[PDB]
Amino acid sequence: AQFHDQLKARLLEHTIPTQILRESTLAWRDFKNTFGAPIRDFSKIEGHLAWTISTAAYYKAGGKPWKLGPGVCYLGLVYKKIQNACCAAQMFLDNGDGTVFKGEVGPWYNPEKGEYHLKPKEAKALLTQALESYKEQNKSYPKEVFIHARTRFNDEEWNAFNEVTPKNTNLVGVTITKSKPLKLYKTEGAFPIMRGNAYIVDEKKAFLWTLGFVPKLQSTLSMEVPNPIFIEINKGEAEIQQVLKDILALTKLNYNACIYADGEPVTLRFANKIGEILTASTEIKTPPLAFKYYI
């Protein structure tokens, strides 16, 4: 069950970009269900398959496939069960316009069994790490810190964030929840709601369709009917429209894949990946912090 996670974790100390390729992926035709078609039917997706692998092989080899199109750091933190461990993923833009997307690691441990929140000291440590990373990569403090997570930020941990953040810097905390039971259909066509439509329930909470029918792709990124993601501005001041625009922008940086877009923002996904990688094995001091060693 934990082969990939353990292998990626044990390679973290001696930095080695590794890609695990299953035999059932590379040469799927040979392995057959013993009564018919191969156990994995990749015939419809071969090029796409190659696409992803090539991009992954181009990413871990130190190549940057695509950028994004300032002064704002988007930080997605995700809690993994082990005690719980919070792991972050940061992305921003520097003076060179080459988007920096590495992700903050060194998971912060909350001893509580089910409190998916950070103690004040851990929150201050995480925010200091992220802010100092921004300062080192941009020689100046960011204009805004855009925290988003799959959990709602409590008053205590957000207050700790506010104490530890510097002046003239606005920080926003967003609860991005998936699998919200709002199946919005289409009554005239036979095809689902197109990707990008948003249902603003309130000035701070809304539904976003980061996935669905795409005109350019001439089909849907999701089978059946798309499930919108609930974007709620839980803390801080921010326009809901700008927040949804930022979330749609984040849904483009999935270097782990060659796909038009993914249902959830990339920062949360990569924070989840590095969190699984870390929690696979024993503690690692100053983890590499670059995605090619986890993804």
Partner: protein, 131 residues
């Protein structure tokens, strides 16, 4: 009867400053940003695993077609898209001939022994996990 706000699709940059919505099409027409010169592939696996990886790598070199080529673009080929060579004749192969711990440790210490001792450089190690 509620207002649905539209968010314009954001453009992801590509080579030569051109921005496209689809990562695949942008890769095909323009290509990636940074020009790594090649991929010194490392393989850690069995003999059949190395054969599978080499055959699929050579398949990657040639264009490969999706069944429905408008909903998911074609693959022009690794050199066609990324502009860097990833041929299968320059591969660094390491042969493999609690249970999760030992199985991980075998590929592991093969990888560290090859990264520490072997002279040849490997940009990325492709662990062909057997099935």
């Amino acid at each position: 009867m509620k207002e649905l706000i539209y968010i314009e699709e954001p453009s992801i940059l590509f080579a030569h400053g051109q921005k496209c919505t689809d990562p695949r099409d942008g890769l095909a027409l323009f290509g990636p940003l940074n020009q790594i010169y090649g991929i010194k592939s490392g393989v850690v696996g069995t003999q059949k695993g190395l054969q599978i990886f080499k055959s699929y790598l050579d398949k990657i070199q040639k264009p490969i077609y999706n069944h429905n080529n408008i909903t998911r673009p074609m693959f022009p080929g690794f050199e066609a898209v990324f502009g860097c060579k990833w041929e299968s004749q320059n591969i660094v192969f390491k042969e493999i001939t609690k249970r999760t711990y030992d199985l991980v440790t075998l590929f592991n210490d093969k990888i560290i022994t090859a990264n520490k001792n072997d002279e040849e450089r490997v940009d990325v190690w492709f662990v062909i996990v057997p099935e």
